[PDB]
Amino acid sequence: LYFQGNMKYLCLIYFDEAKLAAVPAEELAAIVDECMTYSDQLGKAGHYIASHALQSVQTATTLRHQGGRLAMTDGPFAETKEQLGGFYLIEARDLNQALQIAAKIPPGRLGCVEVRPVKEWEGS
Amino acid sequence: LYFQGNMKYLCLIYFDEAKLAAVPAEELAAIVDECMTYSDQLGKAGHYIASHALQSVQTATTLRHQGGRLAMTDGPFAETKEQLGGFYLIEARDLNQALQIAAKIPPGRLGCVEVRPVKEWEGS
């Protein structure tokens, strides 16, 4: 007998925010539409778990535990070339299938998509 | 009449993977337990939506759309001092309440927690 499935993967959508100005507003809207349509197809296929587009890192607030002290700072965890702009939490039969799905995430064309397996293996 | 709530926030858990070796294995296990207990309390309170610990960035695979070409590379989106090691997707009345919850995420003590509002505002 084998443990019964449910391999989940976090598909991280990374892209330079400073380049959304260069992208025509109408095409940017298309990505949003294709994204809703893709999520629906994923849902019907049984892959969809959750997904969200994130607001600018400018809206972020970071909390860091230093000594035993908590410090609050404006902005993201760190300055990076590409910021985390959204994610898709899915379940697939394996990493290869997860990559096939991630390759189709619409917003991913704005930069890249990092596929990371989660630790939790739900099943029996 | 006001639009009816459901403000969601992504609490990103960041920490240097190279320092999990320095953390005593037993204390590391405690964090895992406090984490399960905290998720349960969050669930009962109505804040919990989803949460996952991520496997090492070594298990990551990144997909990037260049010209019209898709390139696959081993590893994360980029090399950073602290890697994204997990997340909590929650809903709170506002950012201040979201920060109060994030300040209590157990794994957050390994580095920092970035709280980012999602774009989607579900309700009516």
JSON list of C-alpha atoms in Angstrom, two decimals:
[
{"chain": "A", "resi": 1, "resn": "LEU", "atom": "CA", "xyz": [0.00, 0.00, 0.00]},
{"chain": "A", "resi": 2, "resn": "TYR", "atom": "CA", "xyz": [1.21, 3.49, -0.82]},
{"chain": "A", "resi": 3, "resn": "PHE", "atom": "CA", "xyz": [0.65, 6.75, 1.04]},
{"chain": "A", "resi": 4, "resn": "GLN", "atom": "CA", "xyz": [-2.21, 8.46, -0.79]},
{"chain": "A", "resi": 5, "resn": "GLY", "atom": "CA", "xyz": [-1.15, 11.50, -2.78]},
{"chain": "A", "resi": 6, "resn": "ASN", "atom": "CA", "xyz": [-1.76, 15.23, -2.50]},
{"chain": "A", "resi": 7, "resn": "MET", "atom": "CA", "xyz": [1.60, 16.73, -3.50]},
{"chain": "A", "resi": 8, "resn": "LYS", "atom": "CA", "xyz": [1.33, 20.52, -3.21]},
{"chain": "A", "resi": 9, "resn": "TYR", "atom": "CA", "xyz": [3.50, 23.23, -4.76]},
{"chain": "A", "resi": 10, "resn": "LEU", "atom": "CA", "xyz": [3.76, 26.99, -4.29]},
{"chain": "A", "resi": 11, "resn": "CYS", "atom": "CA", "xyz": [4.17, 28.82, -7.61]},
{"chain": "A", "resi": 12, "resn": "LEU", "atom": "CA", "xyz": [5.79, 32.17, -6.83]},
{"chain": "A", "resi": 13, "resn": "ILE", "atom": "CA", "xyz": [5.28, 34.98, -9.33]},
{"chain": "A", "resi": 14, "resn": "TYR", "atom": "CA", "xyz": [8.30, 37.28, -9.47]},
{"chain": "A", "resi": 15, "resn": "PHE", "atom": "CA", "xyz": [8.72, 40.44, -11.55]},
{"chain": "A", "resi": 16, "resn": "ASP", "atom": "CA", "xyz": [10.20, 43.91, -11.48]},
{"chain": "A", "resi": 17, "resn": "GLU", "atom": "CA", "xyz": [7.42, 46.27, -10.32]},
{"chain": "A", "resi": 18, "resn": "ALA", "atom": "CA", "xyz": [9.23, 49.20, -11.95]},
{"chain": "A", "resi": 19, "resn": "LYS", "atom": "CA", "xyz": [8.41, 47.72, -15.33]},
{"chain": "A", "resi": 20, "resn": "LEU", "atom": "CA", "xyz": [4.62, 47.56, -15.05]},
{"chain": "A", "resi": 21, "resn": "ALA", "atom": "CA", "xyz": [4.63, 51.16, -16.23]},
{"chain": "A", "resi": 22, "resn": "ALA", "atom": "CA", "xyz": [6.16, 50.06, -19.51]},
{"chain": "A", "resi": 23, "resn": "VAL", "atom": "CA", "xyz": [3.43, 47.46, -20.02]},
{"chain": "A", "resi": 24, "resn": "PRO", "atom": "CA", "xyz": [0.39, 48.87, -21.84]},
{"chain": "A", "resi": 25, "resn": "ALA", "atom": "CA", "xyz": [-2.51, 49.11, -19.41]},
{"chain": "A", "resi": 26, "resn": "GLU", "atom": "CA", "xyz": [-4.82, 47.18, -21.75]},
{"chain": "A", "resi": 27, "resn": "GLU", "atom": "CA", "xyz": [-2.45, 44.22, -22.10]},
{"chain": "A", "resi": 28, "resn": "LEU", "atom": "CA", "xyz": [-1.99, 44.31, -18.34]},
{"chain": "A", "resi": 29, "resn": "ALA", "atom": "CA", "xyz": [-5.77, 43.92, -18.06]},
{"chain": "A", "resi": 30, "resn": "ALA", "atom": "CA", "xyz": [-5.68, 40.95, -20.42]},
{"chain": "A", "resi": 31, "resn": "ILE", "atom": "CA", "xyz": [-3.23, 39.18, -18.08]},
{"chain": "A", "resi": 32, "resn": "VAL", "atom": "CA", "xyz": [-5.73, 39.74, -15.28]},
{"chain": "A", "resi": 33, "resn": "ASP", "atom": "CA", "xyz": [-8.49, 38.19, -17.35]},
{"chain": "A", "resi": 34, "resn": "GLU", "atom": "CA", "xyz": [-6.48, 35.22, -18.58]},
{"chain": "A", "resi": 35, "resn": "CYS", "atom": "CA", "xyz": [-5.51, 34.74, -14.97]},
{"chain": "A", "resi": 36, "resn": "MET", "atom": "CA", "xyz": [-9.12, 34.45, -13.79]},
{"chain": "A", "resi": 37, "resn": "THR", "atom": "CA", "xyz": [-9.89, 32.09, -16.66]},
{"chain": "A", "resi": 38, "resn": "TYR", "atom": "CA", "xyz": [-6.82, 29.95, -15.91]},
{"chain": "A", "resi": 39, "resn": "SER", "atom": "CA", "xyz": [-7.69, 29.70, -12.20]},
{"chain": "A", "resi": 40, "resn": "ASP", "atom": "CA", "xyz": [-11.15, 28.46, -13.18]},
{"chain": "A", "resi": 41, "resn": "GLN", "atom": "CA", "xyz": [-9.71, 25.82, -15.46]},
{"chain": "A", "resi": 42, "resn": "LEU", "atom": "CA", "xyz": [-7.29, 24.80, -12.72]},
{"chain": "A", "resi": 43, "resn": "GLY", "atom": "CA", "xyz": [-10.18, 24.58, -10.29]},
{"chain": "A", "resi": 44, "resn": "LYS", "atom": "CA", "xyz": [-12.20, 22.34, -12.60]},
{"chain": "A", "resi": 45, "resn": "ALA", "atom": "CA", "xyz": [-9.12, 20.14, -13.12]},
{"chain": "A", "resi": 46, "resn": "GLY", "atom": "CA", "xyz": [-8.62, 19.72, -9.37]},
{"chain": "A", "resi": 47, "resn": "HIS", "atom": "CA", "xyz": [-5.26, 21.52, -9.17]},
{"chain": "A", "resi": 48, "resn": "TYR", "atom": "CA", "xyz": [-6.43, 24.79, -7.69]},
{"chain": "A", "resi": 49, "resn": "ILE", "atom": "CA", "xyz": [-6.09, 25.41, -3.96]},
{"chain": "A", "resi": 50, "resn": "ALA", "atom": "CA", "xyz": [-5.53, 29.19, -3.78]},
{"chain": "A", "resi": 51, "resn": "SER", "atom": "CA", "xyz": [-4.03, 32.16, -5.60]},
{"chain": "A", "resi": 52, "resn": "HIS", "atom": "CA", "xyz": [-3.61, 35.90, -5.06]},
{"chain": "A", "resi": 53, "resn": "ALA", "atom": "CA", "xyz": [-1.99, 38.87, -6.72]},
{"chain": "A", "resi": 54, "resn": "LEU", "atom": "CA", "xyz": [-0.11, 40.95, -4.16]},
{"chain": "A", "resi": 55, "resn": "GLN", "atom": "CA", "xyz": [-0.18, 44.70, -3.75]},
{"chain": "A", "resi": 56, "resn": "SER", "atom": "CA", "xyz": [3.10, 46.60, -4.17]},
{"chain": "A", "resi": 57, "resn": "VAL", "atom": "CA", "xyz": [6.01, 45.93, -1.80]},
{"chain": "A", "resi": 58, "resn": "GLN", "atom": "CA", "xyz": [5.39, 49.56, -0.89]},
{"chain": "A", "resi": 59, "resn": "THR", "atom": "CA", "xyz": [2.34, 48.32, 1.03]},
{"chain": "A", "resi": 60, "resn": "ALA", "atom": "CA", "xyz": [4.42, 45.75, 2.90]},
{"chain": "A", "resi": 61, "resn": "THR", "atom": "CA", "xyz": [5.49, 45.89, 6.55]},
{"chain": "A", "resi": 62, "resn": "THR", "atom": "CA", "xyz": [8.19, 43.62, 7.93]},
{"chain": "A", "resi": 63, "resn": "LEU", "atom": "CA", "xyz": [8.51, 42.31, 11.49]},
{"chain": "A", "resi": 64, "resn": "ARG", "atom": "CA", "xyz": [11.86, 41.06, 12.75]},
{"chain": "A", "resi": 65, "resn": "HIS", "atom": "CA", "xyz": [12.66, 39.42, 16.07]},
{"chain": "A", "resi": 66, "resn": "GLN", "atom": "CA", "xyz": [16.15, 40.57, 17.01]},
{"chain": "A", "resi": 67, "resn": "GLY", "atom": "CA", "xyz": [17.35, 39.93, 20.56]},
{"chain": "A", "resi": 68, "resn": "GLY", "atom": "CA", "xyz": [14.01, 39.17, 22.19]},
{"chain": "A", "resi": 69, "resn": "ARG", "atom": "CA", "xyz": [12.82, 42.45, 20.72]},
{"chain": "A", "resi": 70, "resn": "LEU", "atom": "CA", "xyz": [10.39, 42.91, 17.83]},
{"chain": "A", "resi": 71, "resn": "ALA", "atom": "CA", "xyz": [11.18, 45.60, 15.25]},
{"chain": "A", "resi": 72, "resn": "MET", "atom": "CA", "xyz": [8.70, 46.89, 12.69]},
{"chain": "A", "resi": 73, "resn": "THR", "atom": "CA", "xyz": [9.91, 48.29, 9.39]},
{"chain": "A", "resi": 74, "resn": "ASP", "atom": "CA", "xyz": [8.19, 49.69, 6.33]},
{"chain": "A", "resi": 75, "resn": "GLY", "atom": "CA", "xyz": [8.54, 47.78, 3.07]},
{"chain": "A", "resi": 76, "resn": "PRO", "atom": "CA", "xyz": [9.51, 44.18, 2.14]},
{"chain": "A", "resi": 77, "resn": "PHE", "atom": "CA", "xyz": [11.94, 41.70, 3.72]},
{"chain": "A", "resi": 78, "resn": "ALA", "atom": "CA", "xyz": [14.69, 43.03, 1.47]},
{"chain": "A", "resi": 79, "resn": "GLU", "atom": "CA", "xyz": [15.36, 44.95, -1.73]},
{"chain": "A", "resi": 80, "resn": "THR", "atom": "CA", "xyz": [15.48, 42.63, -4.75]},
{"chain": "A", "resi": 81, "resn": "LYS", "atom": "CA", "xyz": [15.59, 43.09, -8.53]},
{"chain": "A", "resi": 82, "resn": "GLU", "atom": "CA", "xyz": [12.24, 41.30, -8.88]},
{"chain": "A", "resi": 83, "resn": "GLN", "atom": "CA", "xyz": [9.58, 41.45, -6.15]},
{"chain": "A", "resi": 84, "resn": "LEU", "atom": "CA", "xyz": [7.14, 38.71, -5.16]},
{"chain": "A", "resi": 85, "resn": "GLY", "atom": "CA", "xyz": [3.96, 39.84, -6.88]},
{"chain": "A", "resi": 86, "resn": "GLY", "atom": "CA", "xyz": [1.62, 36.88, -6.46]},
{"chain": "A", "resi": 87, "resn": "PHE", "atom": "CA", "xyz": [1.23, 33.12, -6.11]},
{"chain": "A", "resi": 88, "resn": "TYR", "atom": "CA", "xyz": [-0.73, 30.00, -7.02]},
{"chain": "A", "resi": 89, "resn": "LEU", "atom": "CA", "xyz": [-0.92, 27.19, -4.46]},
{"chain": "A", "resi": 90, "resn": "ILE", "atom": "CA", "xyz": [-1.67, 24.00, -6.38]},
{"chain": "A", "resi": 91, "resn": "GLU", "atom": "CA", "xyz": [-1.49, 20.25, -6.09]},
{"chain": "A", "resi": 92, "resn": "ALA", "atom": "CA", "xyz": [-0.17, 18.12, -8.93]},
{"chain": "A", "resi": 93, "resn": "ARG", "atom": "CA", "xyz": [0.93, 14.50, -9.36]},
{"chain": "A", "resi": 94, "resn": "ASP", "atom": "CA", "xyz": [4.59, 15.54, -9.36]},
{"chain": "A", "resi": 95, "resn": "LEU", "atom": "CA", "xyz": [7.00, 18.42, -9.93]},
{"chain": "A", "resi": 96, "resn": "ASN", "atom": "CA", "xyz": [6.94, 17.93, -13.68]},
{"chain": "A", "resi": 97, "resn": "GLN", "atom": "CA", "xyz": [3.18, 18.39, -13.78]},
{"chain": "A", "resi": 98, "resn": "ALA", "atom": "CA", "xyz": [3.51, 21.36, -11.41]},
{"chain": "A", "resi": 99, "resn": "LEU", "atom": "CA", "xyz": [5.99, 22.98, -13.84]},
{"chain": "A", "resi": 100, "resn": "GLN", "atom": "CA", "xyz": [3.59, 22.41, -16.75]},
{"chain": "A", "resi": 101, "resn": "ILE", "atom": "CA", "xyz": [0.93, 24.34, -14.85]},
{"chain": "A", "resi": 102, "resn": "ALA", "atom": "CA", "xyz": [3.31, 27.07, -13.68]},
{"chain": "A", "resi": 103, "resn": "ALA", "atom": "CA", "xyz": [4.54, 27.59, -17.26]},
{"chain": "A", "resi": 104, "resn": "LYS", "atom": "CA", "xyz": [0.97, 28.67, -18.03]},
{"chain": "A", "resi": 105, "resn": "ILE", "atom": "CA", "xyz": [0.38, 31.15, -15.20]},
{"chain": "A", "resi": 106, "resn": "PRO", "atom": "CA", "xyz": [-0.40, 34.40, -17.16]},
{"chain": "A", "resi": 107, "resn": "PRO", "atom": "CA", "xyz": [1.35, 36.91, -14.83]},
{"chain": "A", "resi": 108, "resn": "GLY", "atom": "CA", "xyz": [4.47, 34.76, -15.01]},
{"chain": "A", "resi": 109, "resn": "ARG", "atom": "CA", "xyz": [5.28, 36.40, -18.33]},
{"chain": "A", "resi": 110, "resn": "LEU", "atom": "CA", "xyz": [6.09, 39.61, -16.46]},
{"chain": "A", "resi": 111, "resn": "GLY", "atom": "CA", "xyz": [9.21, 37.96, -15.01]},
{"chain": "A", "resi": 112, "resn": "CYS", "atom": "CA", "xyz": [9.52, 34.41, -13.74]},
{"chain": "A", "resi": 113, "resn": "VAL", "atom": "CA", "xyz": [7.72, 31.80, -11.68]},
{"chain": "A", "resi": 114, "resn": "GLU", "atom": "CA", "xyz": [9.48, 29.84, -8.96]},
{"chain": "A", "resi": 115, "resn": "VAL", "atom": "CA", "xyz": [7.95, 26.44, -8.20]},
{"chain": "A", "resi": 116, "resn": "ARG", "atom": "CA", "xyz": [8.60, 25.26, -4.64]},
{"chain": "A", "resi": 117, "resn": "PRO", "atom": "CA", "xyz": [7.32, 22.00, -3.09]},
{"chain": "A", "resi": 118, "resn": "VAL", "atom": "CA", "xyz": [5.70, 22.51, 0.31]},
{"chain": "A", "resi": 119, "resn": "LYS", "atom": "CA", "xyz": [6.75, 20.32, 3.25]},
{"chain": "A", "resi": 120, "resn": "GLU", "atom": "CA", "xyz": [3.28, 19.15, 4.27]},
{"chain": "A", "resi": 121, "resn": "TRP", "atom": "CA", "xyz": [2.20, 15.89, 2.64]},
{"chain": "A", "resi": 122, "resn": "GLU", "atom": "CA", "xyz": [-1.54, 15.48, 3.24]},
{"chain": "A", "resi": 123, "resn": "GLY", "atom": "CA", "xyz": [-3.10, 12.03, 2.76]},
{"chain": "A", "resi": 124, "resn": "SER", "atom": "CA", "xyz": [-3.00, 8.45, 4.07]},
{"chain": "B", "resi": 1, "resn": "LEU", "atom": "CA", "xyz": [-23.96, 50.79, 2.99]},
{"chain": "B", "resi": 2, "resn": "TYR", "atom": "CA", "xyz": [-20.36, 49.60, 3.07]},
{"chain": "B", "resi": 3, "resn": "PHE", "atom": "CA", "xyz": [-18.66, 46.90, 1.04]},
{"chain": "B", "resi": 4, "resn": "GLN", "atom": "CA", "xyz": [-18.59, 43.85, 3.29]},
{"chain": "B", "resi": 5, "resn": "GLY", "atom": "CA", "xyz": [-15.14, 42.97, 4.59]},
{"chain": "B", "resi": 6, "resn": "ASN", "atom": "CA", "xyz": [-12.71, 40.12, 4.02]},
{"chain": "B", "resi": 7, "resn": "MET", "atom": "CA", "xyz": [-9.33, 41.86, 3.98]},
{"chain": "B", "resi": 8, "resn": "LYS", "atom": "CA", "xyz": [-6.66, 39.23, 3.32]},
{"chain": "B", "resi": 9, "resn": "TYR", "atom": "CA", "xyz": [-2.91, 39.36, 3.96]},
{"chain": "B", "resi": 10, "resn": "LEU", "atom": "CA", "xyz": [0.01, 37.13, 3.00]},
{"chain": "B", "resi": 11, "resn": "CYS", "atom": "CA", "xyz": [2.47, 36.68, 5.88]},
{"chain": "B", "resi": 12, "resn": "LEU", "atom": "CA", "xyz": [5.81, 35.71, 4.32]},
{"chain": "B", "resi": 13, "resn": "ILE", "atom": "CA", "xyz": [8.28, 33.85, 6.52]},
{"chain": "B", "resi": 14, "resn": "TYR", "atom": "CA", "xyz": [11.86, 34.72, 5.64]},
{"chain": "B", "resi": 15, "resn": "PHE", "atom": "CA", "xyz": [15.04, 33.30, 7.17]},
{"chain": "B", "resi": 16, "resn": "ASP", "atom": "CA", "xyz": [18.57, 32.23, 6.32]},
{"chain": "B", "resi": 17, "resn": "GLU", "atom": "CA", "xyz": [18.44, 28.47, 5.61]},
{"chain": "B", "resi": 18, "resn": "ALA", "atom": "CA", "xyz": [22.15, 28.20, 6.39]},
{"chain": "B", "resi": 19, "resn": "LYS", "atom": "CA", "xyz": [21.37, 28.91, 10.02]},
{"chain": "B", "resi": 20, "resn": "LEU", "atom": "CA", "xyz": [18.93, 26.07, 10.69]},
{"chain": "B", "resi": 21, "resn": "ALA", "atom": "CA", "xyz": [21.99, 23.95, 11.40]},
{"chain": "B", "resi": 22, "resn": "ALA", "atom": "CA", "xyz": [22.86, 26.21, 14.31]},
{"chain": "B", "resi": 23, "resn": "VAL", "atom": "CA", "xyz": [19.37, 25.81, 15.78]},
{"chain": "B", "resi": 24, "resn": "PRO", "atom": "CA", "xyz": [19.10, 22.81, 18.12]},
{"chain": "B", "resi": 25, "resn": "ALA", "atom": "CA", "xyz": [16.96, 20.15, 16.47]},
{"chain": "B", "resi": 26, "resn": "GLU", "atom": "CA", "xyz": [14.69, 19.88, 19.51]},
{"chain": "B", "resi": 27, "resn": "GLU", "atom": "CA", "xyz": [13.91, 23.60, 19.62]},
{"chain": "B", "resi": 28, "resn": "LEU", "atom": "CA", "xyz": [13.33, 23.45, 15.87]},
{"chain": "B", "resi": 29, "resn": "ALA", "atom": "CA", "xyz": [10.71, 20.77, 16.58]},
{"chain": "B", "resi": 30, "resn": "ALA", "atom": "CA", "xyz": [9.07, 22.99, 19.18]},
{"chain": "B", "resi": 31, "resn": "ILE", "atom": "CA", "xyz": [8.60, 25.70, 16.54]},
{"chain": "B", "resi": 32, "resn": "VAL", "atom": "CA", "xyz": [6.86, 23.11, 14.39]},
{"chain": "B", "resi": 33, "resn": "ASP", "atom": "CA", "xyz": [4.53, 22.22, 17.25]},
{"chain": "B", "resi": 34, "resn": "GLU", "atom": "CA", "xyz": [3.76, 25.78, 18.29]},
{"chain": "B", "resi": 35, "resn": "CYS", "atom": "CA", "xyz": [3.07, 26.40, 14.64]},
{"chain": "B", "resi": 36, "resn": "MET", "atom": "CA", "xyz": [0.42, 23.68, 14.42]},
{"chain": "B", "resi": 37, "resn": "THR", "atom": "CA", "xyz": [-1.14, 24.92, 17.66]},
{"chain": "B", "resi": 38, "resn": "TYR", "atom": "CA", "xyz": [-1.14, 28.53, 16.43]},
{"chain": "B", "resi": 39, "resn": "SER", "atom": "CA", "xyz": [-2.76, 27.59, 13.10]},
{"chain": "B", "resi": 40, "resn": "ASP", "atom": "CA", "xyz": [-5.53, 25.83, 15.04]},
{"chain": "B", "resi": 41, "resn": "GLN", "atom": "CA", "xyz": [-6.13, 28.87, 17.20]},
{"chain": "B", "resi": 42, "resn": "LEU", "atom": "CA", "xyz": [-6.16, 31.05, 14.08]},
{"chain": "B", "resi": 43, "resn": "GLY", "atom": "CA", "xyz": [-8.63, 28.68, 12.49]},
{"chain": "B", "resi": 44, "resn": "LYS", "atom": "CA", "xyz": [-10.97, 28.83, 15.47]},
{"chain": "B", "resi": 45, "resn": "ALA", "atom": "CA", "xyz": [-10.71, 32.64, 15.47]},
{"chain": "B", "resi": 46, "resn": "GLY", "atom": "CA", "xyz": [-11.65, 32.84, 11.79]},
{"chain": "B", "resi": 47, "resn": "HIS", "atom": "CA", "xyz": [-8.33, 34.26, 10.56]},
{"chain": "B", "resi": 48, "resn": "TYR", "atom": "CA", "xyz": [-6.88, 31.11, 9.04]},
{"chain": "B", "resi": 49, "resn": "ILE", "atom": "CA", "xyz": [-7.12, 30.54, 5.29]},
{"chain": "B", "resi": 50, "resn": "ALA", "atom": "CA", "xyz": [-3.95, 28.56, 4.53]},
{"chain": "B", "resi": 51, "resn": "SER", "atom": "CA", "xyz": [-0.33, 28.06, 5.56]},
{"chain": "B", "resi": 52, "resn": "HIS", "atom": "CA", "xyz": [2.65, 25.95, 4.50]},
{"chain": "B", "resi": 53, "resn": "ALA", "atom": "CA", "xyz": [6.30, 25.51, 5.34]},
{"chain": "B", "resi": 54, "resn": "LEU", "atom": "CA", "xyz": [8.38, 25.34, 2.17]},
{"chain": "B", "resi": 55, "resn": "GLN", "atom": "CA", "xyz": [11.11, 22.86, 1.35]},
{"chain": "B", "resi": 56, "resn": "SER", "atom": "CA", "xyz": [14.61, 24.23, 0.72]},
{"chain": "B", "resi": 57, "resn": "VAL", "atom": "CA", "xyz": [15.24, 26.60, -2.20]},
{"chain": "B", "resi": 58, "resn": "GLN", "atom": "CA", "xyz": [17.43, 23.72, -3.35]},
{"chain": "B", "resi": 59, "resn": "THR", "atom": "CA", "xyz": [14.20, 21.94, -4.30]},
{"chain": "B", "resi": 60, "resn": "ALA", "atom": "CA", "xyz": [13.01, 24.94, -6.30]},
{"chain": "B", "resi": 61, "resn": "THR", "atom": "CA", "xyz": [12.84, 25.24, -10.09]},
{"chain": "B", "resi": 62, "resn": "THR", "atom": "CA", "xyz": [12.37, 28.58, -11.82]},
{"chain": "B", "resi": 63, "resn": "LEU", "atom": "CA", "xyz": [10.68, 29.23, -15.17]},
{"chain": "B", "resi": 64, "resn": "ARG", "atom": "CA", "xyz": [11.40, 32.44, -17.05]},
{"chain": "B", "resi": 65, "resn": "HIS", "atom": "CA", "xyz": [9.80, 33.69, -20.25]},
{"chain": "B", "resi": 66, "resn": "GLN", "atom": "CA", "xyz": [12.52, 35.53, -22.16]},
{"chain": "B", "resi": 67, "resn": "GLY", "atom": "CA", "xyz": [11.87, 36.43, -25.79]},
{"chain": "B", "resi": 68, "resn": "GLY", "atom": "CA", "xyz": [8.91, 34.16, -26.44]},
{"chain": "B", "resi": 69, "resn": "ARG", "atom": "CA", "xyz": [11.07, 31.35, -25.13]},
{"chain": "B", "resi": 70, "resn": "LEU", "atom": "CA", "xyz": [10.70, 29.54, -21.80]},
{"chain": "B", "resi": 71, "resn": "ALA", "atom": "CA", "xyz": [13.86, 28.75, -19.83]},
{"chain": "B", "resi": 72, "resn": "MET", "atom": "CA", "xyz": [14.00, 26.33, -16.91]},
{"chain": "B", "resi": 73, "resn": "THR", "atom": "CA", "xyz": [16.61, 26.77, -14.20]},
{"chain": "B", "resi": 74, "resn": "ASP", "atom": "CA", "xyz": [17.41, 24.94, -11.00]},
{"chain": "B", "resi": 75, "resn": "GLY", "atom": "CA", "xyz": [16.96, 26.79, -7.72]},
{"chain": "B", "resi": 76, "resn": "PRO", "atom": "CA", "xyz": [15.01, 29.92, -6.64]},
{"chain": "B", "resi": 77, "resn": "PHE", "atom": "CA", "xyz": [14.16, 33.16, -8.47]},
{"chain": "B", "resi": 78, "resn": "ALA", "atom": "CA", "xyz": [17.37, 34.69, -7.14]},
{"chain": "B", "resi": 79, "resn": "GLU", "atom": "CA", "xyz": [20.03, 34.37, -4.45]},
{"chain": "B", "resi": 80, "resn": "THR", "atom": "CA", "xyz": [19.06, 36.28, -1.30]},
{"chain": "B", "resi": 81, "resn": "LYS", "atom": "CA", "xyz": [20.41, 36.53, 2.25]},
{"chain": "B", "resi": 82, "resn": "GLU", "atom": "CA", "xyz": [17.14, 35.14, 3.63]},
{"chain": "B", "resi": 83, "resn": "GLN", "atom": "CA", "xyz": [15.01, 32.68, 1.63]},
{"chain": "B", "resi": 84, "resn": "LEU", "atom": "CA", "xyz": [11.21, 32.43, 1.61]},
{"chain": "B", "resi": 85, "resn": "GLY", "atom": "CA", "xyz": [10.62, 29.47, 3.92]},
{"chain": "B", "resi": 86, "resn": "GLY", "atom": "CA", "xyz": [6.85, 29.50, 4.43]},
{"chain": "B", "resi": 87, "resn": "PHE", "atom": "CA", "xyz": [3.65, 31.54, 4.64]},
{"chain": "B", "resi": 88, "resn": "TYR", "atom": "CA", "xyz": [0.33, 32.11, 6.37]},
{"chain": "B", "resi": 89, "resn": "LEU", "atom": "CA", "xyz": [-2.57, 33.44, 4.29]},
{"chain": "B", "resi": 90, "resn": "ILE", "atom": "CA", "xyz": [-4.99, 35.11, 6.70]},
{"chain": "B", "resi": 91, "resn": "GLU", "atom": "CA", "xyz": [-7.83, 37.57, 6.82]},
{"chain": "B", "resi": 92, "resn": "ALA", "atom": "CA", "xyz": [-7.98, 40.27, 9.48]},
{"chain": "B", "resi": 93, "resn": "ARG", "atom": "CA", "xyz": [-9.99, 43.45, 10.04]},
{"chain": "B", "resi": 94, "resn": "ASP", "atom": "CA", "xyz": [-7.02, 45.60, 9.02]},
{"chain": "B", "resi": 95, "resn": "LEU", "atom": "CA", "xyz": [-3.25, 45.69, 8.64]},
{"chain": "B", "resi": 96, "resn": "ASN", "atom": "CA", "xyz": [-2.74, 46.40, 12.32]},
{"chain": "B", "resi": 97, "resn": "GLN", "atom": "CA", "xyz": [-4.59, 43.24, 13.29]},
{"chain": "B", "resi": 98, "resn": "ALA", "atom": "CA", "xyz": [-2.69, 41.34, 10.57]},
{"chain": "B", "resi": 99, "resn": "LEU", "atom": "CA", "xyz": [0.61, 42.50, 12.11]},
{"chain": "B", "resi": 100, "resn": "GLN", "atom": "CA", "xyz": [-0.54, 41.37, 15.57]},
{"chain": "B", "resi": 101, "resn": "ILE", "atom": "CA", "xyz": [-1.10, 37.88, 14.17]},
{"chain": "B", "resi": 102, "resn": "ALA", "atom": "CA", "xyz": [2.12, 37.85, 12.13]},
{"chain": "B", "resi": 103, "resn": "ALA", "atom": "CA", "xyz": [4.13, 38.89, 15.21]},
{"chain": "B", "resi": 104, "resn": "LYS", "atom": "CA", "xyz": [3.03, 35.56, 16.70]},
{"chain": "B", "resi": 105, "resn": "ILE", "atom": "CA", "xyz": [3.88, 33.20, 13.83]},
{"chain": "B", "resi": 106, "resn": "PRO", "atom": "CA", "xyz": [6.39, 30.79, 15.52]},
{"chain": "B", "resi": 107, "resn": "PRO", "atom": "CA", "xyz": [8.77, 30.26, 12.55]},
{"chain": "B", "resi": 108, "resn": "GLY", "atom": "CA", "xyz": [9.03, 34.04, 12.22]},
{"chain": "B", "resi": 109, "resn": "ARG", "atom": "CA", "xyz": [11.58, 34.01, 15.02]},
{"chain": "B", "resi": 110, "resn": "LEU", "atom": "CA", "xyz": [14.06, 32.39, 12.63]},
{"chain": "B", "resi": 111, "resn": "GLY", "atom": "CA", "xyz": [14.29, 35.65, 10.67]},
{"chain": "B", "resi": 112, "resn": "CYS", "atom": "CA", "xyz": [11.45, 37.98, 9.79]},
{"chain": "B", "resi": 113, "resn": "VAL", "atom": "CA", "xyz": [7.87, 38.00, 8.56]},
{"chain": "B", "resi": 114, "resn": "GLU", "atom": "CA", "xyz": [6.74, 40.27, 5.74]},
{"chain": "B", "resi": 115, "resn": "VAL", "atom": "CA", "xyz": [3.04, 41.15, 5.79]},
{"chain": "B", "resi": 116, "resn": "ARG", "atom": "CA", "xyz": [1.64, 41.97, 2.34]},
{"chain": "B", "resi": 117, "resn": "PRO", "atom": "CA", "xyz": [-1.99, 42.87, 1.56]},
{"chain": "B", "resi": 118, "resn": "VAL", "atom": "CA", "xyz": [-3.41, 40.90, -1.38]},
{"chain": "B", "resi": 119, "resn": "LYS", "atom": "CA", "xyz": [-5.18, 42.74, -4.21]},
{"chain": "B", "resi": 120, "resn": "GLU", "atom": "CA", "xyz": [-8.39, 40.70, -4.19]},
{"chain": "B", "resi": 121, "resn": "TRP", "atom": "CA", "xyz": [-11.13, 42.12, -1.97]},
{"chain": "B", "resi": 122, "resn": "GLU", "atom": "CA", "xyz": [-13.81, 39.45, -1.58]},
{"chain": "B", "resi": 123, "resn": "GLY", "atom": "CA", "xyz": [-17.26, 40.48, -0.33]},
{"chain": "B", "resi": 124, "resn": "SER", "atom": "CA", "xyz": [-20.27, 42.67, -1.19]}
]
